[PDB]
Amino acid sequence: CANPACGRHYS
């Protein structure tokens, strides 16, 4: 993804 705050996926 281009933007820094994308989503909750990898911990």
Swiss-Prot record:
Transmembrane segments: none annotated. Disulfide bonds join C1-C6. Expressed by the venom duct. This is Alpha-conotoxin GIA. Keywords: Acetylcholine receptor inhibiting toxin, Amidation, Disulfide bond, Ion channel impairing toxin, Neurotoxin, Postsynaptic neurotoxin, Secreted, Toxin. The lineage of its organism: Eukaryota, Metazoa, Spiralia, Lophotrochozoa, Mollusca. Belongs to the conotoxin A superfamily. One of its GO terms (cellular component) is extracellular region. The cysteine framework is I (CC-C-C). Alpha3/5 pattern. The keyword Secreted applies. It is found in: Secreted. Its main location: secreted. Alpha-conotoxins act on postsynaptic membranes, they bind to the nicotinic acetylcholine receptors (nAChR) and thus inhibit them. One of its GO terms (molecular function) is ion channel regulator activity. It comes from the Eukaryota.
